[PDB]
Amino acid sequence: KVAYLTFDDGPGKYTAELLNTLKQHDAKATFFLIGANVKEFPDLVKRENAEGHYVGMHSMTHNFAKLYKNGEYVNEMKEDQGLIANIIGKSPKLTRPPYGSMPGLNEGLRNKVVEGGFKVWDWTIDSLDWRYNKMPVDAAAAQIAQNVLTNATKPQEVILMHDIHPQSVAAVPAILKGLKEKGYEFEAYHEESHFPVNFWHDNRM
């Protein structure tokens, strides 16, 4: 059993704390980074690759109408890939759609994505970490732990978290314990290891 923790919308203030927590539990994870945050936190970006984590994209504007209704998705992932390449010196292919691929990644755009070289990944478990924004972090974290452990049943699992949130980062510790108790490994995504995990079941992606 393998457990792929993914974190969206970063890097951020607590990314550095989260990276320590991972280092200490010998855990590897996956990071979908927004363009403007790689422009601001190059060292975090460079550290994430350096310490054995996948670093994928999550676009430039994280804006629903621009990506999907005006069809800018692939364009802003390519740009995002460019910026990330200017740090880690390789061009990652895996993408994570803002707000998921259903239903905004229509058949025309999923063609552009397969064409452009990119993969798409959604998630299996929504930590629901955004529910507990701005409440007591200790308890807020304990509950997001509960949510994901409660839903860890499958051989492979992909978990949506956000490392721009204190609550979510605070509870990575409990998740790592509960999941490795349940017999899970904690690996990052890799491009030859790629099997499809997308809401459309489009296995080209």
Partner 1 sequence: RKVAYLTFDDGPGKYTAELLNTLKQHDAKATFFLIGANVKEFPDLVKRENAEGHYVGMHSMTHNFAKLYKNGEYVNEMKEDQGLIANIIGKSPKLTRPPYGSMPGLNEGLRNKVVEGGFKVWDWTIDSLDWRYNKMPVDAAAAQIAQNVLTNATKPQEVILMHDIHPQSVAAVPAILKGLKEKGYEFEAYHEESHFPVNFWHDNRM
Q: Residue 200 interacts with partner 1 (CB under 8 A)?
A: yes
Closest separation in Å from C-beta 73 to partner 1? 14
Tokens of 131: 């529910």
Closest separation in Å from C-beta 106 to partner 1? 7
Tokens of 157: 């699992």
Q: Is 127:159 a contact under the CB 8 Å cutoff? A: yes
User: Which residue in the set 132, 184, 186, 189 belongs to the binding site for partner 1 (CB under 8 A)?
Assistant: 132
Select the binding partner of residue 8 from partner 1, Zn ion, none (C-beta < 5 to 8 A, by kind). Zn ion
Select the binding partner of residue 69 from partner 1, Zn ion, none (C-beta < 5 to 8 A, by kind). partner 1
Q: Is 125:148 a contact under the CB 8 Å cutoff? A: yes
Tokens of 80: 């995002």
Q: Residue 9 interacts with Zn ion (CB under 5 A)?
A: yes
The amino acid sitting at 8 is D
- Half-sphere exposure (Cβ direction) of 156: Cα atoms closer than 13 Å: 10
User: Which residue in the set 2, 36, 65, 139 belongs to the binding site for partner 1 (CB under 8 A)?
Assistant: 65
Are β-strands 30-33 and 119-120 bridged in parallel, bridged antiparallel, or unpaired?
unpaired
Instruction: Find the part of the chain contacting partner 1 (CB under 8 A) among 32-40, 57-65, 82-90, 172-180.
Output: 57-65
Instruction: Please count the residues of the chain.
Output: 205
Interacting residues with partner 1 (CB under 8 A): 63-65, 69, 99, 103, 106-107, 111, 126, 130-134, 150-151, 199-202
